[PDB]
Symmetry: D4
Subunit: 160 residues, 8 copies
């Protein structure tokens, strides 16, 4: 039952986006936890979350935030685990501030960044799954089936 | 046998992608380093990506610039995690590279790193952090690498 | 009755845009086919579509996609035919990701790119028509009439 | 007699547009290469574009930078397909060029290629692929060109 | 009664923006004409309009267009008169394509460019007025009064 | 006596604004060329702009880079037409300059020209075209200038 | 009762944004004044406001404006006080013109710039408070309590 | 004892941040100048920021480039005013730096200055203007500095 992925986000307003990561992990039967951790309002909460993640048994962190989106990169600063970043769409700049704040990490501290918005959340979960699948054969088979069905389900022509 | 594949769209990408190669070598991660063009050698890419898992690869690092299709198309054909490095382009400074890699639609992920050499280094570190989840000796070398990075930052600037 | 232009798009959600290409080809009496082909979900479908297009009698491909819009460029990778690309408008980045993903093809593999959105779809069809018109006199006359009427139909003053 | 016209807004565009000229010569496509400015020689452009078809041109490749009106205005006067090359500008690196060319409204197309030398080369290849539809010898030379490009990509980078 | 300013625009859809230039010229009692001239659909109409503007007694042209906005620059190519350009806001790119298509004229062929949208239309008319005011004392006094009243009419505090 | 004032925010702008100065001299338009900083010498700007008309100036050309307030603030204090030249900035290549100049709200216009040297040259030409409306000798020199520009464009590129 | 912070803005339309600065100063019991001052319509009003601010007892100016947003930088040109700038979101360019017009001040004349929109207004007030707190112990304690409560009030998980 | 802390993410930032250091020295403002990386030395940053007030610092000036988290994370841990300097980055010319610093959400401010050396100089001036509110001797030196800047602007450009 113990979580192997942590989904963290900067605010409740991020949940409309990050719920797509939660749903997909659940779909693939990946146990996980989902939390609010603010890089700017709760920096010590973040420090503790990230530095203890590995010893708590987490394998991957998915971090979502918008605007001056420091949460994924600061999480990666404190954990040796892979951290995946979801740029949450922002009001004025449409997530371009989110995206650049996350993806442009300096050499030495990676964040694997996904697309702005719900696509990115879904793909963070899928990327996490593909990481876990490397060591978990049952999950690898579920993921294979999932990817194959996605391919097989694309229609051949538009409803014109 | 290689467990990471580094692929890049052209020789011109090597100045950037060599940083990924160097990091993997530093951490003693067996890997292969190849040129594969999504646009000029699409069948080469198809074969590479579709057979990667069966050949024993665990992670693919793909770098390209401009209309950079290599990472996303690699991901389309493999179930393995694909990490993408936007190579800095001449006119648009890798913004075209970045958007063509990172903005993958839901269903086919590419874990995207920074534009340029930083991104190439970080793709290799991210690959390492993935492999470390099920390779304890590597996990310890990665811990050492991260600890040395942190400990080595000077406290004050030199003039 | 056999198609000489192929219209392909990455998803049903592209049809709201790509229908304008379909309508214009039909207006000019250009036989064509209209399909969904996903570069990221159905890469082998794309490979087969593009590599066989010429032998199937297609002369021009119009490819529409949004976001990380790889469909036109990957189509061009596998066919020797001219490929025309329509950047479909995306939600966050307003088709700028679509545009750059399509137009910035490296030297050696062209995609003739049109405007973001419905304008681009309409112009992909018109550009395809002007290509076909080079060898098809009846079509050339229909296109001449069409262009002339467009010019003649512009009003001289606004409804102020 | 020329079947492709290459036109460019100024001598400063030649460093970019020479790549189109070279490619057409390589594929033995007869063509003319001219300077025509939309803003400085608008009547020259009007005459060039309106008479292109009657002179036997099949495709026009137009390159310009900045507020780049040359391709679109060419297309306004000819029924021929017009391909546009955004020339890299000093300050905005061809983003002004790109948007002023690609964003043509419905009714007057310009098939737009990448910013810079890549775009110039690709405009010539796209013109070739158009002409190839009704010139079998050229179609075979184009097939050879594309096949050589694909076959010539190295498998691994050189240090 | 004869017009001294010409307002031209690429389409009826530009009128929602360009009407602000019309209104302001009328407010300041500047005789003018208002026309649709498309650079891309009616290039010969444009050529004739611009090359004859001076001999018809026009002193300033205000040209508004959106997207690949060639109308102001091509007008300036054919007239020696000052040409003022209004970037009409575009759907996807919010007038950034309009703006760059107008303002980035090469050395030798100026277009005096105003803000994206209605502000720009209003300011094109005001700029035209300030040009005409240089030789027309009655207009100069009307413009002085107008500018002074604008300054005097700014409130001192917000309605909080 | 000067009828055009060229003002610029700093000596660093001169490399750009000298093109305006040269063009006005070429057309024999009497003018003054000054440094006036909106941010460092705001009172100097206030006095310059408020007294420009009474001193006999007809047009002001104002160039600045970065957060470029000089043209707009000049326009705030004078009834004269103000033309603005966005000077290319180091990091953002004049996009900051452009937006801070062109986006004036309704009520206080600045006629804005291209980023850089092209814009400086064109501000002077636009000033000339304004003055030409009520100076026939100048109008004829401007006609000659435009005619020479058009006639001098080559027909084909040099290698 | 005398104001120690001045909030100025270019127009009534800025108030929807700048009210957040007003509210926060009032929340922290910081006396202040709130005015409309237009850099482009009332330049002499601005000159007088900024040059007399210090002698009137103001310690910090918060200046909000949009578009070609010159108000904060021109205020800073005339006062030795710290000036904080709020980029008000603009219609077409989403405050990017506002932001660049404010933040890119040349060396020698600072404006401390905050985020586009309401966030920036709120943070201008908070930044002003943190400046005043350096010399005002009661305010420093109120601000400490405010920051601590903000941190303590972040939820631990989303309402999923 | 220092009353301003200048912190920067790396030695590579020093070319930019030295301008802040120089200005503070010029105005005789005691300060410390340190390297602190948000991403490589997060615990160092935590300790620095949380203890700054108790150590007697009044203002922190933080400079970083790229995904620039240093100013915002500093502000997260201190009640002191934090001023942020976007360092110009190689590919995106500090636009990534700017947006990652300036776009702080309501509740945790960073007063942000221009990209590059101008921003570093202005962060130090802004810090000075803050300190001047409760240090009359400094206020007078700042007045002198601003007056000299204004008086020293030339009236006309040199060729």
């Amino acid at each position: 039952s113990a979580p192997v992925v942590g989904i963290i986000m900067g605010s409740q307003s991020d949940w409309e986006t990050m719920r797509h990561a939660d749903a997909l992990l659940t779909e693939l039967e990946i146990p996980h936890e989902t939390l609010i951790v603010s890089a700017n309002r709760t920096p010590d909460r973040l420090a503790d979350y990230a530095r203890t993640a590995a010893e708590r048994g987490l394998n991957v962190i998915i971090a979502g935030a918008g605007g001056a989106a420091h949460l994924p990169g600061m999480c990666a600063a404190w954990t040796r685990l892979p951290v995946l970043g979801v740029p949450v769409e922002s009001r004025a700049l449409k997530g371009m501030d989110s995206l650049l704040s996350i993806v442009q990490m300096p050499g030495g501290v990676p964040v694997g960044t996904l697309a702005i918005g719900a696509s990115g959340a879904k793909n963070a979960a899928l990327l996490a799954a593909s990481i876990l699948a490397l060591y978990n054969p049952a999950l690898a088979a579920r993921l294979e089936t999932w990817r194959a069905l996605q391919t097989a389900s694309v229609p051949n022509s538009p409803i014109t």
